From Swiss-Prot, chains A, C, F:
Keywords, comma-separated and alphabetical: Antioxidant, Cytoplasm, Disulfide bond, Oxidoreductase, Peroxidase, Redox-active center
Location of the Thioredoxin domain: 3-159
EC number: 1.11.1.24
Protein name (database record): Peroxiredoxin
Organism whose genome encodes this protein: Aquifex aeolicus (strain VF5)
Family under the similarity heading: Belongs to the peroxiredoxin family. Prx6 subfamily.
UniProt lineage: Bacteria, Pseudomonadati, Aquificota, Aquificia, Aquificales
GO terms, molecular function: peroxidase activity; thioredoxin-dependent peroxiredoxin activity
Major place of residence: cytoplasm
A cellular component annotation (GO) from this entry: cytosol
Note: The active site is a conserved redox-active cysteine residue, the peroxidatic cysteine (C(P)), which makes the nucleophilic attack on the peroxide substrate. The peroxide oxidizes the C(P)-SH to cysteine sulfenic acid (C(P)-SOH), which then reacts with another cysteine residue, the resolving cysteine (C(R)), to form a disulfide bridge. The disulfide is subsequently reduced by an appropriate electron donor to complete the catalytic cycle.
Catalytic reactions on record: a hydroperoxide + [thioredoxin]-dithiol = an alcohol + [thioredoxin]-disulfide + H2O
Main function: Thiol-specific peroxidase that catalyzes the reduction of hydrogen peroxide and organic hydroperoxides to water and alcohols, respectively. Plays a role in cell protection against oxidative stress by detoxifying peroxides.
């Protein structure tokens, strides 16, 4: 079903890479960006986690707790975070929910069967300091999210609350430039789904940080 | 429910690290050892996978297809197989089922809620070349299995079928000795459950091949 | 149905060769290996009872109470224990439940109708000192169990509880050797099912301790 | 349940394993009279004395075209072991089949389970069935009390004479004058069998006349 | 249904040749042999009543109350006892229940429709001094009972209770001989069912004490 | 329920002292006087059977088939007829139904529970040559019937049919006198209900033809 | 339904030629002969009423209250009693119930539809001094009753109660003779059913006291 | 129920016994007008005066093609006895049939039973039914109150005139000028009839003008 | 359903040409003649209202309150009374109920659908001083009522109550003659049902007091 804007975010308790969480009660007084990703050790997800990690202080100074979610186990989460540290030198600084039985995913409408009957889509929810769902995004499995738009959305909602205003199309709090570089143009090869293919993938001439994350340009 | 001995093993189609499988149709004419493990990147499971892999030729010459299973995705499975290869020098030579939605696990009674509502226990099923369930074991999350007993069980079942006999307690096909060394006495530290604990775990002085698999001896 | 690992072992009261038992109330503070056998006066079962009996001190020193079970009467049980003492020189030192109406067997999933609608399979259950089911095995009618693996399983479970550890594949508490001899290679002739065949069986040239237990090599 | 089998109607049909192989009852014994009887448990003492008495009278039943067949809830392997035991301890080989009614299905069809007697064992039920498979007469004795084998023979004679001659038979009828002798040996009573292994070991040390742990006799002062 | 061994004998109130009875309450403290017979003025029945009457002291010294039962009226019962006294010189010394509407018969499983939808079979029940049903037999309409086996059964049950023992096959309390004479070989002609046949029956060459009880011998 | 005047008499098949009967198939073309009596070997009943037997030719010349009925067996019936022949010198010339299970009695409303739950009352039914119930009487256990009134009733019903007339109160076909003698004033001692009382009854000084039929005067 | 012998007679309240009655409350301590007749102004009924009236003292000396019943109104009843007095010289000395809506008749099973759906049959009930139904008869519309047998029945019932005895077949309290004369042999012509036929009936040469009561003799 | 019979609809059909034989109603009277009326009880006085008045006017109804027919819950044998009584006591022979409706089946169809009047007798109902079997008019008088026979005749004239000429008739309409005379005899009232035989005997000694025990007259 | 003689007349509250009425409570101690008429401005009805009005004193001296009723409105009632006064010189002296929704008409069985589904028939009810319904008549739409018979009926009912007597056929309290003159022989032309027909009716040569009431004589 459809999570409802302006109502308390669906409550849950779950294991995370930071320990157990009571959501959103454990984050009262903080804004929360809750997002989901289909699967540990898949490539778009890795680029999104790295981008969120690189922007962690941008969220922290906005009183935003980032928290990810997939249907993977907490042990797979830790392994993936370890892998990201090994292959990219970046340590994920925010918790990831282990939603094994899809109980949280279903509360948030994150399972779209034509996309996948087993993985979440790329859902993202902005939740305010009172636990109220404020905004949401549902991107498909193919398509990585825009992390700066998440920051802008948080800025827009916090400004609206603080000042009693609305924000127009394309609003930002101060003049700014979003640079997208040559690196932002590289596309992702869909990851291998067999071990034999994963071994072959590393020999196909792509730019691969690991078997599951290979880039090229279009 | 309890899967029933002497009845066809519950049929299923599943995704695996070797591609899709239609069970047991794809394995007619082969014996099958189907076993489950709670989670990729956990230590008892890793020691079991290495032991099965090292014993892969023992099963192959007995016309046994090994097939593992957990509720993890194939992407976790592949990463885990890569990790074991780097840390232990063995390439897992048998498929692992990605039973994402626990549909196969429930058909086999592999989910025991007091053990885990999300992970399978350490279940193992010996299935004959006709797809019939012949024997089964359910060990808990704490306790690694005895791979040589799985081989003995297969031998006993194959000998019973081939010769029209039964096999007594402690039966083996020829005299033999199962040696357990000092290496087999090391116990496993329960794996870390937070990333912070996983980083600290590697600094605690245990015998660790990776953050999730640290061993020690009892004193 | 499937007994549940980690939950209290299904409770029952039963008659045994040692008198009535209330399970698991009578065994609080002791580990219990409850196992079933299809039928008194059948050969695989006899070899297993002898093996358990020979290892009785191994179980006792581990605070384990052994307890057998079949659907036979207590009078059949006593006759069988008397027969084993006479033919093999060993006195069964542990109780056998007479589960005539299959009430306990069904609570433990011991009846697999394609194996037999009248006899239990070779089920075995490890139960801890608080009555919790810890592990279980289901072997078919053809196939005797591995008694040393039952002891190892007990050791691994007790070490796990005592030390707060897990045990790897093929774990033992100290280096050791399980020797299997030429005697362990003899197979069992399926027992006769008519009195005439039982009389003829003793004249067929096998190695027979009694009409129902004849061995040969393959 | 506990339903009474009906006299004059076909004996309740069943298929079962026996010490002689599988039986389809009563179809396999069509054209023969049948004495179907039950006993609570293999390796119990009154039962042994009854099986010995039936075995000793096997030719009396055979000459009357009577198939004896026993029944208990014990397995066929217990049955064979018990027949082996009787042969060794008494020198008598049981010459008729014993049904293994593992799950009490036959016992319930014949009203043989009386819960105040036992919820697990049959009582001492006995059924005379004619050559057309019709139930003709039946007896239900309790666990304590062995049956009278000569009265079973007399009952068969009386029913066969009734059928052959179109007559009824009076009280105490016999086909020819005869004397049923009961000797001093027939006065010995049975000590209730031990029900634990320890008690069975102790029972053999109590000074009785015991052919085996489960069958000890004495006289009543 | 089948009366249950080891349970209280089914209770009832009825008229008898000795007056009204509340069963088994009126005979508590005595053992009871309750038996049924299909019909007054029929021949096997007469021979059984005479045999029980002759053995009345054997039952009395064992604290046993004999009581018969049929679906005939009490007036038919008294008439039949009078007839037995007139024709045989024997006075029936125990009561006969008048179970006019088959209510008691049904409680004891005495009606077997393939035998008769109107008459009881030859049922007999041994009931102890506590009112518990101990043993029972069901003989068909053709076949008279064995009175000495009833006595032996009582002895065996009383000995079991008194001594805490079981009794073997063919047990007796003391050595003894049961003689069956030439007189015991006479068979019974099925009784006539019409008045004309009853008159003719007396001219057919049998040994008839009355129209309904004719004997002969067979080869 | 009350059998209905003017309607076919309830049909039945029954055993009798003359063999099986099918009512009304066997009696088409004959009038039928069906009557019941509570019990063989009881005194009022005996006096009634003797009176009907003595009047048998009166019924026969009127094309009337007499048929009695009680819930007693045919063996009791025959014994009672034999007894009546010996004590009174008359052979019952009409059949007696053995209505063992009260099925006919209930069809005819012959069971009145306050009188007896096991015996019929003194019911009598006149049935014509077409099987139609024409008249009925129900007397209690105490009170013998009037046999000449039964004959008168038949005459009146047959005259009505033959002549197309009705018959007045006290009608007879020709002048006549019903004599009742000193013998008709003797009353009946209620029969003994125990064997002991029956033996004593024969010693009490009444006018007794047998234990069950003793008379006196008032 | 058939009223039950030995049970209280069905209670009712009704209008009669003597005034209202409550049955059996009004007749406690008296015996009651309740009888019904199909219709006022019909001939058998008239002969029965005259016969009962002539025997009124015989009933009174036996503590018996006679009470008749038909479905006719009290006005028809009174007119009929007037007619009987003029034609036969007897005044009906007992009450007649006006059972307009057949409520009493139905309680007593007096309506037999094949006889009449509107008239009672010739039912008669003897009821004792405690209100208990003791005996009953049902004669058809064609056939007048026997009044002396009603008296004999009352005597037999009262003697049974008084003496604790039964009465045999054909019992009377003292020797006596029931005389039936030439007058008792005349039959009744079925009454006319139209006014025109009633006028013609009086001209047909029968022995007629009135249009509805004409007698003749047979052949 | 009970129902009001409905004006303008077929008169409720029935078959019944009458003093003239069986009738199938209103079927046997098709082509004739019918005056069906009920009376509580044979051998009661108001009813007798009404039957005499109808009998005396029988020719007036006959010439208007009207069949008179009475009805009560009394038996046909009571009916015949009552007509015989009227002939003996008054010299008048009832010339029309009387229905014997013992089981009130017809009475119920016509709403003739009013339990507060009587649960056993009909009231004084009267129904005019035309030659097509259609119910045209009805009146219900109580047990106390005899009917007006000339008003029944006038009602018949009015209905037949309406049908024949296609007109309506005003209040108090008659087909030709006429005079209805009521005499001194018409002023005598009726003593309610005795209901016990003893009272019926005593009634004849009370000094009234009694043609019979049930019909005694006096003046007010 | 038929209103019940001998019971309270169905109660109602209604508007009338004299104001609201509570029926029959407002007439306690008075007799009531309640009558209905199909429709204001129709001819038979007019003749009946004039006849009742002319006889109003006859009713008053008998303690009788006349009250009419139709389904027409009170404004149509008042208009019709005005019309009657203008065309006939008579003032209606009793109330007319306006029973617009037929509620009273249905309580009194005044709606006979084959006569009219919208108008009452010519019903009339005599109700005594206790509100008890005593007598009733139902005449059809074609046929005017007889006003003197209504008075005679009241006299007969009041005399019955006062004297404890019944009144015979054709009873009157004193000798008298009801004269019907030539004027009583004129019949009524059925009234026009369209405005056009009403205009044309006045040109047909009849004796018309108004468009709706035209009289003639018939041969």
């Amino acid at each position: 079903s459809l999570p409802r804007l302006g109502e308390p975010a669906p409550a849950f308790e779950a294991q995370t890479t930071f320990g157990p969480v009571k959501f959103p009660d454990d984050f009262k007084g903080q804004w929360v960006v809750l997002f989901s990703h289909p699967a540990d050790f898949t490539p778009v997800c890795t680029t999104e986690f790295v981008a969120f990690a690189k922007n962690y202080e941008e969220f922290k100074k906005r009183n935003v707790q980032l928290i990810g979610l997939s249907v993977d186990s907490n042990f797979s989460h830790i392994a993936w975070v370890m892998n990201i540290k090994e292959k990219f030198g970046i340590e994920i600084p925010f918790p990831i929910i282990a939603d094994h039985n899809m109980e949280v995913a279903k509360k948030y409408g994150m399972i779209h069967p034509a996309q996948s009957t087993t993985f979440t889509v790329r859902a993202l929810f902005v939740i305010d300091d009172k636990g109220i769902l404020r905004a949401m995004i549902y991107y498909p499995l193919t398509t990585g999210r825009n992390i700066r738009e998440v920051i802008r959305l948080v800025d827009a909602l916090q400004t609206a609350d603080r000042e009693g205003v609305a924000t127009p199309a394309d609003w930002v709090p101060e003049p700014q430039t979003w640079e997208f570089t040559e690196e932002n143009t590289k596309v992702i090869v869909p990851p291998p789904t067999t071990y034999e293919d994963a071994v072959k993938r590393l020999q196909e001439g792509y730019e691969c940080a690991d078997w599951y994350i290979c880039k090229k340009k279009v």
